[PDB]
PDB file of C-alpha atoms in Angstrom:
ATOM      1  CA  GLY A   1      -3.062 102.731-114.327  1.00  0.00           C
ATOM      2  CA  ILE A   2      -4.854 101.646-117.465  1.00  0.00           C
ATOM      3  CA  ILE A   3      -4.624 104.973-119.202  1.00  0.00           C
ATOM      4  CA  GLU A   4      -7.191 104.789-122.002  1.00  0.00           C
ATOM      5  CA  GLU A   5      -5.904 105.662-125.371  1.00  0.00           C
ATOM      6  CA  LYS A   6      -5.280 102.938-128.097  1.00  0.00           C
ATOM      7  CA  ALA A   7      -6.046  99.204-127.942  1.00  0.00           C
ATOM      8  CA  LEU A   8      -4.333  96.310-129.704  1.00  0.00           C
ATOM      9  CA  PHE A   9      -6.570  93.486-131.092  1.00  0.00           C
ATOM     10  CA  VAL A  10      -4.745  90.430-132.509  1.00  0.00           C
ATOM     11  CA  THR A  11      -6.432  87.491-134.189  1.00  0.00           C
ATOM     12  CA  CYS A  12      -5.136  84.203-136.005  1.00  0.00           C
ATOM     13  CA  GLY A  13      -8.305  83.513-137.527  1.00  0.00           C
ATOM     14  CA  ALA A  14      -7.361  80.151-139.273  1.00  0.00           C
ATOM     15  CA  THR A  15      -5.430  77.373-137.193  1.00  0.00           C
ATOM     16  CA  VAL A  16      -2.280  78.634-135.635  1.00  0.00           C
ATOM     17  CA  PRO A  17       0.793  77.390-137.144  1.00  0.00           C
ATOM     18  CA  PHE A  18       2.652  76.345-133.982  1.00  0.00           C
ATOM     19  CA  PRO A  19       1.968  76.968-130.167  1.00  0.00           C
ATOM     20  CA  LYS A  20       5.499  78.266-129.785  1.00  0.00           C
ATOM     21  CA  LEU A  21       5.137  80.793-132.692  1.00  0.00           C
ATOM     22  CA  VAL A  22       2.106  82.312-131.019  1.00  0.00           C
ATOM     23  CA  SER A  23       4.002  82.620-127.732  1.00  0.00           C
ATOM     24  CA  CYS A  24       6.407  85.210-129.537  1.00  0.00           C
ATOM     25  CA  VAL A  25       3.312  87.377-129.973  1.00  0.00           C
ATOM     26  CA  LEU A  26       2.290  86.871-126.420  1.00  0.00           C
ATOM     27  CA  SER A  27       5.660  86.411-124.700  1.00  0.00           C
ATOM     28  CA  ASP A  28       8.399  88.551-123.427  1.00  0.00           C
ATOM     29  CA  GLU A  29       9.290  90.093-126.747  1.00  0.00           C
ATOM     30  CA  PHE A  30       5.563  91.148-127.510  1.00  0.00           C
ATOM     31  CA  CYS A  31       5.074  92.198-123.895  1.00  0.00           C
ATOM     32  CA  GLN A  32       8.208  94.261-123.787  1.00  0.00           C
ATOM     33  CA  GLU A  33       7.235  96.057-127.021  1.00  0.00           C
ATOM     34  CA  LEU A  34       3.791  96.529-125.669  1.00  0.00           C
ATOM     35  CA  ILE A  35       4.547  98.322-122.520  1.00  0.00           C
ATOM     36  CA  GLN A  36       7.049 100.240-124.982  1.00  0.00           C
ATOM     37  CA  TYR A  37       3.815 100.933-127.160  1.00  0.00           C
ATOM     38  CA  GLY A  38       1.817 102.323-124.158  1.00  0.00           C
ATOM     39  CA  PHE A  39      -0.245  99.241-123.419  1.00  0.00           C
ATOM     40  CA  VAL A  40      -4.030  99.490-122.569  1.00  0.00           C
ATOM     41  CA  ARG A  41      -6.201  96.467-123.092  1.00  0.00           C
ATOM     42  CA  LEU A  42      -4.994  93.444-124.973  1.00  0.00           C
ATOM     43  CA  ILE A  43      -7.619  91.202-126.413  1.00  0.00           C
ATOM     44  CA  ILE A  44      -6.796  87.966-128.396  1.00  0.00           C
ATOM     45  CA  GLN A  45      -9.158  85.163-129.668  1.00  0.00           C
ATOM     46  CA  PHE A  46      -9.082  82.659-132.470  1.00  0.00           C
ATOM     47  CA  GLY A  47      -9.390  78.995-133.593  1.00  0.00           C
ATOM     48  CA  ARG A  48     -12.555  76.980-133.535  1.00  0.00           C
ATOM     49  CA  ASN A  49     -12.499  73.381-135.005  1.00  0.00           C
ATOM     50  CA  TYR A  50      -9.027  72.781-133.818  1.00  0.00           C
ATOM     51  CA  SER A  51      -9.908  74.610-130.382  1.00  0.00           C
ATOM     52  CA  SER A  52      -6.368  75.899-130.526  1.00  0.00           C
ATOM     53  CA  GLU A  53      -3.845  74.537-127.596  1.00  0.00           C
ATOM     54  CA  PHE A  54      -2.190  77.491-126.147  1.00  0.00           C
ATOM     55  CA  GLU A  55       1.145  76.368-124.477  1.00  0.00           C
ATOM     56  CA  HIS A  56      -0.438  77.324-121.200  1.00  0.00           C
ATOM     57  CA  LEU A  57       1.247  80.806-121.523  1.00  0.00           C
ATOM     58  CA  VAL A  58      -1.010  82.177-118.756  1.00  0.00           C
ATOM     59  CA  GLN A  59       0.215  79.467-116.162  1.00  0.00           C
ATOM     60  CA  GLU A  60       3.792  79.374-117.644  1.00  0.00           C
ATOM     61  CA  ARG A  61       4.265  83.154-116.867  1.00  0.00           C
ATOM     62  CA  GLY A  62       2.257  82.738-113.697  1.00  0.00           C
ATOM     63  CA  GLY A  63      -0.792  84.625-114.426  1.00  0.00           C
ATOM     64  CA  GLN A  64      -4.241  84.726-112.415  1.00  0.00           C
ATOM     65  CA  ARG A  65      -7.623  83.509-113.844  1.00  0.00           C
ATOM     66  CA  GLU A  66     -10.260  85.946-112.710  1.00  0.00           C
ATOM     67  CA  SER A  67     -13.872  85.023-113.854  1.00  0.00           C
ATOM     68  CA  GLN A  68     -13.871  81.437-112.270  1.00  0.00           C
ATOM     69  CA  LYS A  69     -15.022  79.634-115.419  1.00  0.00           C
ATOM     70  CA  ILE A  70     -12.761  76.960-117.090  1.00  0.00           C
ATOM     71  CA  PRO A  71     -14.820  73.888-118.596  1.00  0.00           C
ATOM     72  CA  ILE A  72     -12.222  72.058-120.798  1.00  0.00           C
ATOM     73  CA  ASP A  73      -9.404  74.202-119.121  1.00  0.00           C
ATOM     74  CA  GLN A  74      -6.725  74.403-121.894  1.00  0.00           C
ATOM     75  CA  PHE A  75      -8.002  77.583-123.493  1.00  0.00           C
ATOM     76  CA  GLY A  76     -11.747  77.061-123.000  1.00  0.00           C
ATOM     77  CA  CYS A  77     -12.685  77.724-126.430  1.00  0.00           C
ATOM     78  CA  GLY A  78     -16.545  77.112-125.604  1.00  0.00           C
ATOM     79  CA  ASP A  79     -16.240  79.781-122.947  1.00  0.00           C
ATOM     80  CA  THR A  80     -16.365  83.599-123.349  1.00  0.00           C
ATOM     81  CA  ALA A  81     -14.943  84.271-119.922  1.00  0.00           C
ATOM     82  CA  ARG A  82     -11.316  84.139-120.403  1.00  0.00           C
ATOM     83  CA  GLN A  83      -9.485  86.805-118.657  1.00  0.00           C
ATOM     84  CA  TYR A  84      -5.700  86.662-117.401  1.00  0.00           C
ATOM     85  CA  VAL A  85      -3.380  89.279-115.961  1.00  0.00           C
ATOM     86  CA  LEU A  86       0.356  89.444-115.746  1.00  0.00           C
ATOM     87  CA  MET A  87       2.408  90.480-112.827  1.00  0.00           C
ATOM     88  CA  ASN A  88      -0.251  92.739-111.465  1.00  0.00           C
ATOM     89  CA  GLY A  89      -2.833  94.433-113.884  1.00  0.00           C
ATOM     90  CA  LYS A  90       0.293  94.860-116.328  1.00  0.00           C
ATOM     91  CA  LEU A  91      -0.870  92.908-119.374  1.00  0.00           C
ATOM     92  CA  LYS A  92      -4.597  91.998-119.638  1.00  0.00           C
ATOM     93  CA  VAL A  93      -5.092  88.852-122.032  1.00  0.00           C
ATOM     94  CA  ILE A  94      -8.890  88.377-122.563  1.00  0.00           C
ATOM     95  CA  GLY A  95     -10.586  86.329-125.138  1.00  0.00           C
ATOM     96  CA  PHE A  96     -14.519  86.476-125.687  1.00  0.00           C
ATOM     97  CA  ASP A  97     -15.263  86.415-129.445  1.00  0.00           C
ATOM     98  CA  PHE A  98     -15.130  83.610-132.179  1.00  0.00           C
ATOM     99  CA  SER A  99     -15.402  85.204-135.759  1.00  0.00           C
ATOM    100  CA  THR A 100     -18.826  86.605-134.393  1.00  0.00           C
ATOM    101  CA  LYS A 101     -17.830  89.752-132.768  1.00  0.00           C
ATOM    102  CA  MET A 102     -14.555  90.808-134.156  1.00  0.00           C
ATOM    103  CA  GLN A 103     -16.322  94.093-135.531  1.00  0.00           C
ATOM    104  CA  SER A 104     -17.933  94.470-132.144  1.00  0.00           C
ATOM    105  CA  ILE A 105     -14.345  94.704-130.506  1.00  0.00           C
ATOM    106  CA  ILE A 106     -12.833  97.201-132.964  1.00  0.00           C
ATOM    107  CA  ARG A 107     -15.769  99.770-133.017  1.00  0.00           C
ATOM    108  CA  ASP A 108     -15.467  99.919-129.278  1.00  0.00           C
ATOM    109  CA  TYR A 109     -11.848 100.804-129.310  1.00  0.00           C
ATOM    110  CA  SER A 110     -10.733 101.327-132.984  1.00  0.00           C
ATOM    111  CA  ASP A 111      -7.090 102.348-132.650  1.00  0.00           C
ATOM    112  CA  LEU A 112      -4.832  99.473-133.834  1.00  0.00           C
ATOM    113  CA  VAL A 113      -5.070  95.891-134.761  1.00  0.00           C
ATOM    114  CA  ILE A 114      -2.508  93.189-135.652  1.00  0.00           C
ATOM    115  CA  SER A 115      -3.893  90.794-138.252  1.00  0.00           C
ATOM    116  CA  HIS A 116      -1.508  88.181-139.387  1.00  0.00           C
ATOM    117  CA  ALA A 117      -3.636  87.759-142.609  1.00  0.00           C
ATOM    118  CA  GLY A 118      -7.301  87.994-141.564  1.00  0.00           C
ATOM    119  CA  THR A 119      -8.860  89.113-144.695  1.00  0.00           C
ATOM    120  CA  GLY A 120     -11.807  90.483-142.799  1.00  0.00           C
ATOM    121  CA  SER A 121      -9.876  91.921-139.921  1.00  0.00           C
ATOM    122  CA  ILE A 122      -7.745  94.048-142.356  1.00  0.00           C
ATOM    123  CA  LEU A 123     -10.880  94.884-144.239  1.00  0.00           C
ATOM    124  CA  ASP A 124     -12.119  97.280-141.434  1.00  0.00           C
ATOM    125  CA  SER A 125      -8.842  98.756-140.492  1.00  0.00           C
ATOM    126  CA  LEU A 126      -8.334  99.480-144.286  1.00  0.00           C
ATOM    127  CA  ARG A 127     -11.592 101.653-144.413  1.00  0.00           C
ATOM    128  CA  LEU A 128     -10.633 103.310-141.076  1.00  0.00           C
ATOM    129  CA  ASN A 129      -7.272 104.259-142.659  1.00  0.00           C
ATOM    130  CA  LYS A 130      -5.866 102.552-139.571  1.00  0.00           C
ATOM    131  CA  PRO A 131      -2.098 101.562-139.993  1.00  0.00           C
ATOM    132  CA  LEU A 132      -1.629  97.833-138.998  1.00  0.00           C
ATOM    133  CA  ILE A 133       1.082  95.447-139.130  1.00  0.00           C
ATOM    134  CA  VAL A 134       0.593  92.202-141.124  1.00  0.00           C
ATOM    135  CA  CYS A 135       2.346  89.241-139.640  1.00  0.00           C
ATOM    136  CA  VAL A 136       3.013  86.997-142.926  1.00  0.00           C
ATOM    137  CA  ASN A 137       3.659  83.378-142.479  1.00  0.00           C
ATOM    138  CA  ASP A 138       6.657  82.614-144.875  1.00  0.00           C
ATOM    139  CA  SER A 139       6.856  79.144-143.034  1.00  0.00           C
ATOM    140  CA  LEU A 140       3.275  78.160-144.218  1.00  0.00           C
ATOM    141  CA  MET A 141       1.728  78.677-147.556  1.00  0.00           C
ATOM    142  CA  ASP A 142      -1.434  76.562-147.444  1.00  0.00           C
ATOM    143  CA  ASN A 143      -3.079  79.322-145.625  1.00  0.00           C
ATOM    144  CA  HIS A 144      -5.600  80.894-147.880  1.00  0.00           C
ATOM    145  CA  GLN A 145      -5.568  84.051-145.747  1.00  0.00           C
ATOM    146  CA  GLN A 146      -1.920  84.730-146.661  1.00  0.00           C
ATOM    147  CA  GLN A 147      -2.511  84.104-150.276  1.00  0.00           C
ATOM    148  CA  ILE A 148      -4.875  86.944-150.095  1.00  0.00           C
ATOM    149  CA  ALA A 149      -2.189  88.929-148.349  1.00  0.00           C
ATOM    150  CA  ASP A 150       0.532  88.786-151.067  1.00  0.00           C
ATOM    151  CA  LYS A 151      -2.026  90.621-153.159  1.00  0.00           C
ATOM    152  CA  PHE A 152      -1.858  93.708-150.770  1.00  0.00           C
ATOM    153  CA  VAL A 153       1.659  94.080-151.664  1.00  0.00           C
ATOM    154  CA  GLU A 154       1.266  93.859-155.269  1.00  0.00           C
ATOM    155  CA  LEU A 155      -0.773  96.927-154.975  1.00  0.00           C
ATOM    156  CA  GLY A 156       1.745  98.635-152.913  1.00  0.00           C
ATOM    157  CA  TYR A 157       3.818  97.141-149.973  1.00  0.00           C
ATOM    158  CA  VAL A 158       1.355  96.837-146.926  1.00  0.00           C
ATOM    159  CA  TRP A 159       3.620  96.648-143.781  1.00  0.00           C
ATOM    160  CA  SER A 160       4.538  93.065-143.979  1.00  0.00           C
ATOM    161  CA  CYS A 161       6.998  91.491-141.439  1.00  0.00           C
ATOM    162  CA  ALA A 162       7.305  87.941-140.020  1.00  0.00           C
ATOM    163  CA  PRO A 163       7.198  87.487-136.094  1.00  0.00           C
ATOM    164  CA  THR A 164      10.813  88.817-135.143  1.00  0.00           C
ATOM    165  CA  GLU A 165      12.065  91.325-132.668  1.00  0.00           C
ATOM    166  CA  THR A 166      14.084  92.938-135.387  1.00  0.00           C
ATOM    167  CA  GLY A 167      11.427  92.864-138.140  1.00  0.00           C
ATOM    168  CA  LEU A 168       8.192  93.163-136.203  1.00  0.00           C
ATOM    169  CA  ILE A 169       9.430  96.462-134.488  1.00  0.00           C
ATOM    170  CA  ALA A 170      10.014  97.963-138.078  1.00  0.00           C
ATOM    171  CA  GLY A 171       6.368  97.517-138.947  1.00  0.00           C
ATOM    172  CA  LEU A 172       5.159  98.973-135.697  1.00  0.00           C
ATOM    173  CA  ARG A 173       7.107 102.119-135.781  1.00  0.00           C
ATOM    174  CA  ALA A 174       6.306 102.507-139.461  1.00  0.00           C
ATOM    175  CA  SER A 175       2.537 102.001-138.789  1.00  0.00           C
ATOM    176  CA  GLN A 176       2.728 104.998-136.478  1.00  0.00           C
ATOM    177  CA  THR A 177       4.388 107.244-139.005  1.00  0.00           C
ATOM    178  CA  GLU A 178       2.524 106.597-142.318  1.00  0.00           C
ATOM    179  CA  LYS A 179      -0.950 105.341-143.282  1.00  0.00           C
ATOM    180  CA  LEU A 180      -2.158 103.226-146.352  1.00  0.00           C
ATOM    181  CA  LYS A 181      -3.940 105.055-149.124  1.00  0.00           C
ATOM    182  CA  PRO A 182      -7.851 104.517-148.784  1.00  0.00           C
ATOM    183  CA  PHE A 183      -8.286 101.342-150.626  1.00  0.00           C
ATOM    184  CA  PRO A 184     -11.073  99.148-149.168  1.00  0.00           C
ATOM    185  CA  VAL A 185     -10.889  95.941-151.331  1.00  0.00           C
ATOM    186  CA  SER A 186     -14.201  93.936-151.670  1.00  0.00           C
ATOM    187  CA  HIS A 187     -17.187  96.216-151.297  1.00  0.00           C
ATOM    188  CA  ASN A 188     -18.235  94.491-148.072  1.00  0.00           C
ATOM    189  CA  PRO A 189     -17.102  94.731-144.206  1.00  0.00           C
ATOM    190  CA  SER A 190     -15.392  91.783-142.501  1.00  0.00           C
ATOM    191  CA  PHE A 191     -19.156  90.467-142.413  1.00  0.00           C
ATOM    192  CA  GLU A 192     -18.339  88.698-145.889  1.00  0.00           C
ATOM    193  CA  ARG A 193     -15.863  86.469-143.800  1.00  0.00           C
ATOM    194  CA  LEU A 194     -18.737  85.438-141.631  1.00  0.00           C
ATOM    195  CA  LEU A 195     -19.974  83.399-144.455  1.00  0.00           C
ATOM    196  CA  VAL A 196     -16.685  81.409-144.528  1.00  0.00           C
ATOM    197  CA  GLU A 197     -17.028  80.301-141.114  1.00  0.00           C
ATOM    198  CA  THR A 198     -20.781  79.675-141.612  1.00  0.00           C
ATOM    199  CA  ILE A 199     -19.963  77.770-144.885  1.00  0.00           C
ATOM    200  CA  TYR A 200     -23.464  76.828-145.471  1.00  0.00           C
ATOM    201  CA  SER A 201     -25.994  79.591-145.246  1.00  0.00           C
TER     202      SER A 201
END
């Protein structure tokens, strides 16, 4: 069954690098590692202006769209009713939050999150001594989010690993063995990020 225990929240925050790269985080590699991690309830959501693209991963794998509601189809960014299932209730891919509910999802579960470089996302996970895995984007560099990431290492060596089946697993297993010393950068919750998206108050 579902077996409530630990959830896994992942967010790309800024515009994703390439539709194919994301697939790795939502493909066979990620799926296999998920079941091996005791899957529970997967939730994913990001992008806004670019409206993302999603290489039709749901249809590609042959998923089933529950809540009948797909305006612009594609990924339905302007829709909070995105819910897909794999095989048969195996993997649950759902998206219903756009930089305006992230904290809402964590508090509800609060167990484990995979932030590639989300300054806000890591912020909460930090105060909650929650061990997460940071997917660093060596390929890119213009991403300000990563810039803020490289700083975390300077202080120590935050679990950093690029989207690889050999490297990503190292961070996962490591995150379930040791925690990062209480260090909540910026005296403010992920809310501070909200200002970035809002830009003008």
